[PDB]
């Protein structure tokens, strides 16, 4: 016997177009989305508006008592986030995690600053069917797709309930999952079993058009299932006759704005150390100083806030001359997605809360000892044929570029427009001389960190630009005290390969491949290139204690200055950063922390290299059965560690290649793939993998990623061989066609395009698309125009391409004449003699040789280039690099 709902769907389909239109809204309740859609069309994220209707559905279920949200809220099919953003406003809710399918056709999560947005984490591109269930407190799901055939809605609704059946197996205290088709005979005793097993009932939310029978399976309900589904069918059937009734209008929920207070687990401040700097900042902005009860800092100590103007932008321009010369890539999402990052207060605080506001537990006691042994042995190793020294002011002057950040904080430090101007003002060196005096008296007065978002070219997130990574540096006078105490590590090349065996400091991309090729000649197992997830946030206070052991090899007075710069600046940090507030105003927060590593410290690269070496040196020990599982707690016989280093330490170092946090290790066997107890206990958890799954290695060294590239071995036409770097072509092109500028002129972007083109000729000459596209750009840009900009942030991209000199002449200097891996120094005089990658690897790394749209782009490039010359201006002087 067909159910009442099946007779409702029978009539619903038999209606005509006009019958349907009169019935869809007849007598339903509806929220007022007018004054919300406009603010959302303008970009007003501080308006307290809800991102969709579904937010008002959730409130109705809450007021009635059907839903009691709390704890970790998981929101399957969160859409724009209507359910997630409302959940983050409830008193008992403390974490919101929503997932949705993105891409074309589907809604992507919105970015709004409603109340509690800091506890929200939305992720797109997720298909919840292929997503394993995790424990949670509140489970939300709003995933159906209406159709017209009840056999499809039943099939789709059954498929949904087989997916949420795994999540409910984890016993969530509250849930609200959407049943799209509850009215069929099969769907009724599918729900009858699920109600016996998990409880709750079916509720019909009046904020729903009469054209769907959808009901929500909520936890605070207990109405009988057939009675629930059928009573709704009688309402929907009854509305099909006769008169059309008015729609009742409610007022939309207003979620508010700001952040919400959070449980604090931050370490106890050392107000004897950082107290003077906090007082100095508070007194400077004393007129607007206050304490915000709603600050979002879990693992940083909070000291106060004051009103401040906003900084940064979320805008990203396009390079017109690269975009025209790279037409066939306008349909590749691999390049069209690359756009600048978002450095506004919201843009960085959004990434800060998830990535930098963390707290890794202290390593165990045996671990902490092994670290101390290996680190003290590594400093003694590095400092054998090399001694620490104090660097001078005369050195620091000749090392500040034009774009060295001043970075003042206190009013006395705000007297100069540029850094090179300040370093010539004797008042500047008076502030330094005055600060070092405080250091020698055990105090610190000026050394405070500036934090902000780094401006990069990365793949977008949702529809918009991705949030920004944090960079932090101190004011110029404090950065000099840093330099004269620890700068010897950089200026004396402690981390170079000659001194450390495993370092690579100072080298460029044009030489790293020869190190991996040499590393493959020694015997052993596969190569391993695991990466720590967010390295600068795992540098514990014990990692910092071990780095401070360099001060043992110092003259006593030099040890004093370094310890003042370490005890007051590295082991205690006073950070200044912006945050959005309630109402659109932006505010400055003063926070403090006692672990992690600042990105802009003078010795960041050197110390990250040191600690990463110590990490891989220990992981070799666990893999060779020197350290056991009892050793993590209490170090058994410590003499067994000192002997493994004295016998094999220098050889394992020769088997590595470490640049900062990036590393590649060639162990002696594949036990290194599953030596993880010390790796995890030190906080150095690996990236994009499960915390205990053994790692994967490469049998082929021409595939190992290192410093964002891999390296292939090529052979010049007749004879010699070079080892070149290579990466996926889509991000090389994609970065080149995004211009960082804020309204640049045509001449100025055409210069930025000559930089990406000439860099390609130097490092990626072996990519058929880039070799052609670089000649096309260099033919469309005037010859005498000098390249501007920055085509890479890599410390290994040295920049031999930022020149007007002939590119073939700077090519020979880099790859032949000044390449020590080149016995024969015969010059190369024609580009046609410089080879390509194999047609297989080109395609594998993003090339489009065989595709029709690229074959046409090639044979039209001369006409394409002549069209670009009129756009730069055909009265300029051009050369024909295309032949
Ligand atoms: N298999 C799947 N995996 C993840 N998301 C899916 C999915 N199938 C559909 N979706 C998404 O789930 C969303 C449900 S709409 C619900 C959104 C939310 N209630 C709000 O108030 O905004 C749709 O946007 C759809 O794109
Ligand atoms: Zn100081
Ligand atoms: Zn490649």
Numbering used by the authors: 5 to 887
List sentences from the manuscript.
Nonstructural protein 5 (NS5) is essential for the replication of the flaviviral RNA genome. The N-terminal portion of NS5 contains a methyltransferase (MT), followed by a short linker that connects to the RNA-dependent RNA polymerase (RdRp). The MT adds the 5′ RNA cap structure to facilitate translation of the polyprotein and to decrease elicitation of the host innate immune response. The RdRp initiates RNA synthesis by a de novo mechanism wherein a single-nucleotide triphosphate serves as a primer for nucleotide polymerization.
We expressed the full-length NS5 from ZIKV strain MR766 that was originally isolated from Uganda Africa and determined its crystal structure at 3.0 Å resolution. The MT is complexed with S-adenosyl-L-homocysteine (SAH), and the RdRp adopts a classic ‘right-hand' structure consisting of three subdomains: fingers, palm and thumb. Two zinc ions are found in the fingers subdomain and at the junction of the palm and thumb subdomains of the RdRp. The overall structure of the ZIKV NS5 has striking similarities to that of the JEV NS5, with the RMS deviation of 0.55 Å for 751 Cα atoms. The MT of the ZIKV NS5 connects to the fingers subdomain of the RdRp and overhangs the NTP channel of the RdRp. The MT interacts with the fingers subdomain of the RdRp primarily through a hydrophobic network that involves residues Pro113, Leu115 and Trp121 from the MT and Tyr350, Phe466 and Pro584 from the RdRp. The total buried surface area between the MT and the RdRp is ∼1,600 Å2. Full-length NS5 only has one conformation in the corresponding region and it resembles that of conformation 2. Notably, motif F in NS5 binds with the MT and has a different conformation relative to that in Δ264. The net effect of the presence of the MT is that the RdRp has a reconfigured template channel and possesses a more open NTP channel.
